Amino acid sequence: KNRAARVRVSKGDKPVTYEEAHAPHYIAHRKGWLSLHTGNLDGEDHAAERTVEDVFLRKFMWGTFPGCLADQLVLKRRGNQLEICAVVLRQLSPHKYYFLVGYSETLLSYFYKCPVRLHLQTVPSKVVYKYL
Amino acid sequence: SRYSPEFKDPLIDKEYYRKPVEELTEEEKYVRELKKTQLIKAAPAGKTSSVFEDPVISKFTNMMMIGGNKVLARSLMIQTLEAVKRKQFEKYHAASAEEQATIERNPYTIFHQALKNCEPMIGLVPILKGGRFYQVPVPLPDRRRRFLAMKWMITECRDKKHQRTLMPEKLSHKLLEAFHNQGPVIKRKHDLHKMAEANRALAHYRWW
Amino acid sequence: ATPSLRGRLARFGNPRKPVLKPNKPLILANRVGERRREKGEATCITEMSVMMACWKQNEFRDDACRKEIQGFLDCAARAQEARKMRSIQETLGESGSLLPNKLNKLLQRFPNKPYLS
Amino acid sequence: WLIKEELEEMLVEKLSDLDYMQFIRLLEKLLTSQCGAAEEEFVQRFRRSVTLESKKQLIEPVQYDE
RNA sequence: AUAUACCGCCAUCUUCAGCAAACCCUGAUGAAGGCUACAAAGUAAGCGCAAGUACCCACGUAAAGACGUUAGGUCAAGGUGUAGCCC
RNA sequence: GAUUAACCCAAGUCAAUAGAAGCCGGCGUAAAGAGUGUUUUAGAUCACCCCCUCCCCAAUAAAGCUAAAACUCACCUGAGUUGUAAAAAACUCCAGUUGACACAAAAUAGACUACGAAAGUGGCUUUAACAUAUCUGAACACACAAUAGCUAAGACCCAAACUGGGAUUAGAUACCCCACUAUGCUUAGCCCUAAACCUCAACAGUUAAAUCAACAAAACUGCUCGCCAGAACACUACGAGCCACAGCUUAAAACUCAAA
Ligand SMILES: [K+]
Ligand SMILES: [K+]
Ligand SMILES: [K+]
Ligand SMILES: [K+]
Ligand SMILES: [K+]
Ligand SMILES: [K+]
Ligand SMILES: [K+]
Ligand SMILES: [Mg+2]
Ligand SMILES: [Mg+2]
Ligand SMILES: [Mg+2]
Ligand SMILES: [Mg+2]
Ligand SMILES: [Mg+2]
Ligand SMILES: [Mg+2]
Ligand SMILES: [Mg+2]
Ligand SMILES: [Mg+2]
Ligand SMILES: [Mg+2]
Ligand SMILES: [Mg+2]
Ligand SMILES: [Mg+2]
Ligand SMILES: [Mg+2]
Ligand SMILES: [Mg+2]
Ligand SMILES: [Mg+2]
Ligand SMILES: [Mg+2]
Ligand SMILES: [Mg+2]
Ligand SMILES: [Mg+2]
Ligand SMILES: [Mg+2]
Ligand SMILES: [Mg+2]
Ligand SMILES: [Mg+2]
Ligand SMILES: [Mg+2]
Ligand SMILES: [Mg+2]
Ligand SMILES: [Mg+2]
Hints:
This is part of a larger assembly, with chains A, B, C and D. By secondary structure, chain B is mainly alpha-helical. In chain B, 50% of the residues lie in helices and 10% in strands. Chain B has eight helices and four strands, in the order βααβαααββααα. In chain B, strand 3 and strand 4 form a beta hairpin. In chain B, helix 3 packs across helix 4 and helix 4 packs across helix 5. Chain B starts with 6 loop residues before the first strand and ends in a 10-residue tail after the last helix. Chain C is an all-alpha fold. Chain C is built from three helices and no strands. The longest helix of chain D has 15 residues. Chain D is elongated, with a radius of gyration of 21 Å. The termini of chain D are far apart. Chains B and C meet through helix 8 of B and helix 1 and helix 2 of C. The structure holds two RNA strands. Chain A: It comes from Homo sapiens (Human). Chain A: Its main location: mitochondrion. Chain A: Keywords: Mitochondrion, Ribonucleoprotein, Ribosomal protein, Transit peptide. Chain A: This is Small ribosomal subunit protein uS3m. Chain A: One of its GO terms (biological process) is mitochondrial translation.
């Protein structure tokens, strides 16, 4: 039986998001990609470098906004701009979100030598697609 | 199959279509109006509406084909038909006016009759009775009779007993032998009849 | 008339020794058995022996056994078409008595009641 | 005849396979009778158009060269 | 060291169609069992099959394929519980 | 096991041993209705009232009888007969037709359900003949009791332990094939056993109540006799009785287990 990226059936009490509820064979069919760049197009270079950066940004944001992320990050690249779109919860005070936004954008801009921006969308709770 | 079950096989017969409407029966009129609403498969590249088409020779050619090399198989076939015709024209010119009337020079007539002389009437089929298989003589369907005749002829020509003889000369020689009820292919038919006659006691095991 | 069952089984009140020792209770089931697949008789075996008789006397030369070979061939074809029709008629029409499946549907509607309600 | 999933939408209920057969067997029994106009508009409510595409070959236009 | 502590990714039946919470009923309220369409106690969310999608179609081929089975495979992808080594 | 803590009792604690604490329950399948019938001393209330299945069908003993099929012999004829999943061995004074021809066994009827205490009893005829005007009543009294078996004398178609031969098999002291004996039969005596089980005691009564663990063949009442009390040891040992001498009947204990 296949396992890769499959939330297995339970007793009907496990809430799953839309992304978590779709196995890998639905990528490009019912769900899009979590990162968009030109590295994987035919005749394009630097796919390896873009990949390492994406893996780091996901770990950085997970530990920088602990317990706040309500979904996976969406990483977008246009030119030399880097946009990070995250869906967060409404538990931390706004002051701490503004501190962490100013802190993370500045730190990542100096780390990867490019203008980085972080767009936050807050939700009252984790959006549930179904109960497995 | 890439054809859905809705596709029907094509009917390649000019006469079938030029037949007047008056000669048609109420059943044949229904089939013609029915096919106008059905899906038809594309005609295969094998058969055409040619007047020189022979389905038996086409089938014998495919049974000689090795690894999809139809060009070579078809080449061996026409060389055999030419070899049979040249042997009959040589036998015809060397014969007397009386003997000439009995000499066949049409290679298609010789080919069909030679295969017909090698078709077995009965065969041995294993029937289970009491937990054991017995070789029971049974009547063969028409398809199986014709297939065995072709397979025996082709197998005999591929036998290593023939040293350096090319296929068109081997096959043309075997066809003319079978055309006269002689040769090893006729002997193979007689053996199957002798082995089916020896097991005559087991004939009642059949139930059809 | 069904044979009697009075005083046939070992029971309280029945003095005599039992007449019957059924290994299953004598109570009608709500179904009948499935008809067993039958083995038919071989066809044209008579014409087959006549053909193989001329072969033995003519050194297995088909030229001398044409009438016997033809008879055995025609019989085989006729026995083939008849075999093709025996299925369409006897298997589907259910001539005569009903088939077990149809007869069991009729018993479903009038089940045997060995208990009280 | 409409399929079971289409009947389940006209009724807005869940049907069994045998429930669907019973209803179709009863409509067919209504056509064999001498149904009038009132009994014909009712049966057509459950008949769906099975449009049969024509197998007639399309003919190319006849052009003319210089 | 331990795949017989495990995650992760899989083999296998599967070239399957079943799995099942929550209830209801039967068996004197026992382990258990629950169908008959001219119907007689079953109703069932969800999961799988199916449907959709990819490839050249509605065909085919891919993909998919639950719950479970073999303490099946992998501590040597990586991670890791327990135990062990630290001139 | 040490250690920490806790629990119980307490000038005691509680290891070993012993005692106290036990028949109105059961007997189709868990242990138990002991093969059958009769009676005694007695017991019971089912005995008077108050009543409906006498005779016949396959009980038993004796004598006689024989239709079908065998065996044997004879004539004629054939050269093979037997054996089967398939062979071998065996026979070849063998086989087939026809005729003559049992101290053996009793198609069909019987889809009947009778007789007898049970065991048993189903070809025909005849003689004799199937206890009891309350019920119950025995391992042992009294009389019986399938098959196998013993003693003695006969019969012998067929079957057949054992034995011999053939085959199979790793082996085959078997299963398969052939041959033949004790034995199955008669007579006169023994032996006294059975899954002798319809595993359901006899007699009287009931179908309502709680119908009833399960299964089996619905659940009960009165009365009587018999029998049973974890498993195994044990259809055994010992004693006693017996026409039984490798037998039968009656029938324990020790050691063992926490189940059966
Ligand atoms: K694993
Ligand atoms: K690992
Ligand atoms: K490890
Ligand atoms: K003391
Ligand atoms: K008799
Ligand atoms: K006994
Ligand atoms: K019994
Ligand atoms: Mg796979
Ligand atoms: Mg039984
Ligand atoms: Mg494993
Ligand atoms: Mg498809
Ligand atoms: Mg696949
Ligand atoms: Mg699918
Ligand atoms: Mg393992
Ligand atoms: Mg008992
Ligand atoms: Mg009889
Ligand atoms: Mg008495
Ligand atoms: Mg006593
Ligand atoms: Mg006794
Ligand atoms: Mg005796
Ligand atoms: Mg004796
Ligand atoms: Mg004998
Ligand atoms: Mg003797
Ligand atoms: Mg006698
Ligand atoms: Mg008896
Ligand atoms: Mg008594
Ligand atoms: Mg005991
Ligand atoms: Mg004994
Ligand atoms: Mg003894
Ligand atoms: Mg003694």
